[PDB]
Amino acid sequence: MRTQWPSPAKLNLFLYITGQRADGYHTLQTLFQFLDYGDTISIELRDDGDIRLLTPVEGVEHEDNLIVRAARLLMKTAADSGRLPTGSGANISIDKRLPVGGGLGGGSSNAATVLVALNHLWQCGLSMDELAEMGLTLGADVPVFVRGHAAFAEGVGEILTPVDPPEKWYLVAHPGVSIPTPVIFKDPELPRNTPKRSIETLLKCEFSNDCEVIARKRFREVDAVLSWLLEYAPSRLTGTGACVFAEFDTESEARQVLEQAPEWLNGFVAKGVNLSPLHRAML
Ligand SMILES: Nc1ncnc2c1ncn2[C@@H]1O[C@H](COP(=O)(O)OP(=O)(O)O)[C@@H](O)[C@H]1O
Numbered sequence: 001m002r003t004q005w006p007s008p009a010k011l012n013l014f015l016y017i018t019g020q021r022a023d024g025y026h027t028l029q030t031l032f033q034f035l036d037y038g039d040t041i042s043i044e045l046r047d048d049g050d051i052r053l054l055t056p057v058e059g060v061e062h063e064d065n066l067i068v069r070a071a072r073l074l075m076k077t078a079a080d081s082g083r084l085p086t087g088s089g090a091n092i093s094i095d096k097r098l099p100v101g102g103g104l105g106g107g108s109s110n111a112a113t114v115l116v117a118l119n120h121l122w123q124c125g126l127s128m129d130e131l132a133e134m135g136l137t138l139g140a141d142v143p144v145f146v147r148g149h150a151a152f153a154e155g156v157g158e159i160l161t162p163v164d165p166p167e168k169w170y171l172v173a174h175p176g177v178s179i180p181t182p183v184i185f186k187d188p189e190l191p192r193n194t195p196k197r198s199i200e201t202l203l204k205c206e207f208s209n210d211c212e213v214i215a216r217k218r219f220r221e222v223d224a225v226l227s228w229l230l231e232y233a234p235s236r237l238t239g240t241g242a243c244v245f246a247e248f249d250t251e252s253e254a255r256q257v258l259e260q261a262p263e264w265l266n267g268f269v270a271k272g273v274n275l276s277p278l279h280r281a282m283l
Pocket residue numbers: 057059060064065066067099100101102103104105106107108110141181239241
């Protein structure tokens with residue numbers, strides 16, 4: 001049998017850099033929300049103990065792909081504690097709608113979906129905490145997808161507190177530039193002193209993203225898309241770029257603005273979801 005699993009995107013509704021730990025990573029205060037929209041992963045069970053990503057993802061080698069890395073990490077952890085039935089294997093393909101590397105957390109969502117899926121399919125019996133713990137080794141975006149709820153995240157993004165923001169409609173645009181997350185986070189002028197505030201203070205202050213100023217200042221493609229969308233609705237950067245989103249109260253308004261968007265926006269519309277489509281699909 002073949003099972004299909006959603007791999008939704010995420011938005012950083014806000015994002016503030018509160019410092020940098022010794023290991024190079026930054027401590028932040030951010031708010032994750034999912035989009036009812038993203039990739040679709042299909043898994044066929046194997047009995048020979050192999051893991052095969054059948055559909056290749058452009059620019060990623062098989063063993064470098066987060067799908068495979070999450071699959072082998074799960075395999076190793078389960079076999080190291082006798083939770084992997086003999087011969088556990090899987091064929092994995094992916095219908096990818098999400099851009100590679102745009103701050104939508106696609107790859108990180110792909111890893112979380114594989115972990116939760118294969119954990120159910122192999123009957124490893126691992127817990128949310130264990131899965132989210134393994135996901136952190138793969139990336140700081142991964143835990144939020146593993147736990148499956150919109151959340152106020154701190155630390156490096158793994159300290160998650162479930163919260164239910166309004167499920168606005170979003171026009172999500174991808175500027176035609178690739179922004180390596182290292183470039184933004186290594187920039188000197190990036191704010192790393194934003195004061196740690198309470199959720200209630202953050203929920204009433206104006207939402208912003210501390211990385212937007214650098215991304216805007218260094219990539220005119222990101223500046224172009226931002227200037228265009230801000231004429232219509234509140235628009236901000238998500239993650240470290242390059243993607244940008246604008247908030248709309250209704251689907252018609254959002255889609256109307258997308259009908260007018262020049263093609264260089266590379267934009268789609270999607271409703272926000274406080275419950276991850278993946279976890280919605282596990283009930
Ligand atoms: N299945 C995958 N899909 C997308 N990116 C992947 C995948 N596996 C590994 N990656 C890596 O992650 C990067 C893309 O980042 P991604 O998480 O998709 O966007 P962002 O994290 O900027 O929102 C690429 O450098 C690529 O090597």
